[PDB]
Amino acid sequence: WVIVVGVIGVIG
């Protein structure tokens, strides 16, 4: 959150 990561985050 708030919609933030192309390849390695949570998502998120």
Side-chain angles (χ1 to χ4, degrees):
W1 305 307
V2 186
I3 304 84
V4 94
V5 183
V7 315
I8 320 181
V10 177
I11 76 60

PDB file of all heavy atoms in Angstrom:
ATOM      1  N   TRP A   1       0.821  -1.223   0.000  1.00  0.00           N
ATOM      2  CA  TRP A   1       0.000   0.000   0.000  1.00  0.00           C
ATOM      3  C   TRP A   1       0.857   1.276   0.000  1.00  0.00           C
ATOM      4  O   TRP A   1       1.901   1.293   0.635  1.00  0.00           O
ATOM      5  CB  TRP A   1      -0.971  -0.032   1.186  1.00  0.00           C
ATOM      6  CG  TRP A   1      -1.850  -1.246   1.262  1.00  0.00           C
ATOM      7  CD1 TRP A   1      -2.646  -1.727   0.284  1.00  0.00           C
ATOM      8  CD2 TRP A   1      -2.025  -2.155   2.387  1.00  0.00           C
ATOM      9  NE1 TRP A   1      -3.294  -2.862   0.719  1.00  0.00           N
ATOM     10  CE2 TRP A   1      -2.930  -3.188   2.007  1.00  0.00           C
ATOM     11  CE3 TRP A   1      -1.476  -2.222   3.687  1.00  0.00           C
ATOM     12  CZ2 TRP A   1      -3.271  -4.239   2.869  1.00  0.00           C
ATOM     13  CZ3 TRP A   1      -1.810  -3.273   4.563  1.00  0.00           C
ATOM     14  CH2 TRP A   1      -2.699  -4.284   4.156  1.00  0.00           C
ATOM     15  N   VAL A   2       0.487   2.417  -0.703  1.00  0.00           N
ATOM     16  CA  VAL A   2      -0.769   2.574  -1.517  1.00  0.00           C
ATOM     17  C   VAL A   2      -0.507   2.394  -3.036  1.00  0.00           C
ATOM     18  O   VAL A   2      -0.244   3.331  -3.776  1.00  0.00           O
ATOM     19  CB  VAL A   2      -1.589   3.859  -1.170  1.00  0.00           C
ATOM     20  CG1 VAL A   2      -2.935   3.863  -1.941  1.00  0.00           C
ATOM     21  CG2 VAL A   2      -1.875   3.986   0.347  1.00  0.00           C
ATOM     22  N   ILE A   3      -0.591   1.126  -3.474  1.00  0.00           N
ATOM     23  CA  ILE A   3      -0.213   0.620  -4.807  1.00  0.00           C
ATOM     24  C   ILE A   3       1.211   1.117  -5.164  1.00  0.00           C
ATOM     25  O   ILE A   3       1.369   2.011  -5.978  1.00  0.00           O
ATOM     26  CB  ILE A   3      -1.300   0.887  -5.879  1.00  0.00           C
ATOM     27  CG1 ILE A   3      -2.691   0.320  -5.510  1.00  0.00           C
ATOM     28  CG2 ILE A   3      -0.910   0.232  -7.216  1.00  0.00           C
ATOM     29  CD1 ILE A   3      -3.558   1.221  -4.613  1.00  0.00           C
ATOM     30  N   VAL A   4       2.336   0.556  -4.557  1.00  0.00           N
ATOM     31  CA  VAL A   4       3.717   1.142  -4.737  1.00  0.00           C
ATOM     32  C   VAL A   4       4.914   0.280  -5.300  1.00  0.00           C
ATOM     33  O   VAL A   4       6.033   0.767  -5.271  1.00  0.00           O
ATOM     34  CB  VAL A   4       4.082   1.936  -3.421  1.00  0.00           C
ATOM     35  CG1 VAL A   4       4.892   1.132  -2.359  1.00  0.00           C
ATOM     36  CG2 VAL A   4       4.789   3.274  -3.722  1.00  0.00           C
ATOM     37  N   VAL A   5       4.839  -1.011  -5.848  1.00  0.00           N
ATOM     38  CA  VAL A   5       6.096  -1.813  -6.118  1.00  0.00           C
ATOM     39  C   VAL A   5       6.053  -2.824  -7.310  1.00  0.00           C
ATOM     40  O   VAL A   5       5.511  -3.913  -7.178  1.00  0.00           O
ATOM     41  CB  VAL A   5       6.609  -2.561  -4.835  1.00  0.00           C
ATOM     42  CG1 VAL A   5       7.935  -3.310  -5.121  1.00  0.00           C
ATOM     43  CG2 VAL A   5       6.822  -1.666  -3.591  1.00  0.00           C
ATOM     44  N   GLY A   6       6.625  -2.536  -8.553  1.00  0.00           N
ATOM     45  CA  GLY A   6       6.689  -3.556  -9.661  1.00  0.00           C
ATOM     46  C   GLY A   6       7.149  -4.975  -9.254  1.00  0.00           C
ATOM     47  O   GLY A   6       6.353  -5.899  -9.247  1.00  0.00           O
ATOM     48  N   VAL A   7       8.481  -5.213  -8.897  1.00  0.00           N
ATOM     49  CA  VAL A   7       8.999  -6.610  -8.667  1.00  0.00           C
ATOM     50  C   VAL A   7       9.249  -7.153  -7.209  1.00  0.00           C
ATOM     51  O   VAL A   7       8.788  -8.249  -6.936  1.00  0.00           O
ATOM     52  CB  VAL A   7       9.955  -7.119  -9.799  1.00  0.00           C
ATOM     53  CG1 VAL A   7       9.339  -6.780 -11.184  1.00  0.00           C
ATOM     54  CG2 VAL A   7      11.435  -6.682  -9.716  1.00  0.00           C
ATOM     55  N   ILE A   8       9.947  -6.508  -6.170  1.00  0.00           N
ATOM     56  CA  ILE A   8      10.111  -7.112  -4.802  1.00  0.00           C
ATOM     57  C   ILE A   8       9.569  -6.229  -3.618  1.00  0.00           C
ATOM     58  O   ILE A   8      10.307  -5.504  -2.964  1.00  0.00           O
ATOM     59  CB  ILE A   8      11.568  -7.633  -4.549  1.00  0.00           C
ATOM     60  CG1 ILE A   8      12.163  -8.335  -5.812  1.00  0.00           C
ATOM     61  CG2 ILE A   8      11.572  -8.553  -3.301  1.00  0.00           C
ATOM     62  CD1 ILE A   8      13.594  -8.895  -5.628  1.00  0.00           C
ATOM     63  N   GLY A   9       8.220  -6.232  -3.260  1.00  0.00           N
ATOM     64  CA  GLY A   9       7.667  -5.444  -2.111  1.00  0.00           C
ATOM     65  C   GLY A   9       6.867  -6.277  -1.088  1.00  0.00           C
ATOM     66  O   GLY A   9       7.442  -6.958  -0.248  1.00  0.00           O
ATOM     67  N   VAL A  10       5.520  -6.229  -1.154  1.00  0.00           N
ATOM     68  CA  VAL A  10       4.646  -7.224  -0.504  1.00  0.00           C
ATOM     69  C   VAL A  10       3.803  -8.014  -1.525  1.00  0.00           C
ATOM     70  O   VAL A  10       4.103  -9.188  -1.692  1.00  0.00           O
ATOM     71  CB  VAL A  10       3.881  -6.677   0.724  1.00  0.00           C
ATOM     72  CG1 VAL A  10       2.943  -7.728   1.312  1.00  0.00           C
ATOM     73  CG2 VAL A  10       4.873  -6.242   1.814  1.00  0.00           C
ATOM     74  N   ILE A  11       2.736  -7.504  -2.274  1.00  0.00           N
ATOM     75  CA  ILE A  11       2.175  -6.104  -2.217  1.00  0.00           C
ATOM     76  C   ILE A  11       0.927  -5.947  -1.335  1.00  0.00           C
ATOM     77  O   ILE A  11       0.097  -6.836  -1.203  1.00  0.00           O
ATOM     78  CB  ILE A  11       2.212  -5.300  -3.574  1.00  0.00           C
ATOM     79  CG1 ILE A  11       1.168  -5.655  -4.685  1.00  0.00           C
ATOM     80  CG2 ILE A  11       3.631  -5.347  -4.196  1.00  0.00           C
ATOM     81  CD1 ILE A  11      -0.307  -5.484  -4.274  1.00  0.00           C
ATOM     82  N   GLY A  12       0.732  -4.751  -0.644  1.00  0.00           N
ATOM     83  CA  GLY A  12       1.544  -3.484  -0.653  1.00  0.00           C
ATOM     84  C   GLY A  12       0.710  -2.207  -0.902  1.00  0.00           C
ATOM     85  O   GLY A  12      -0.019  -2.098  -1.879  1.00  0.00           O
TER      86      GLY A  12
END
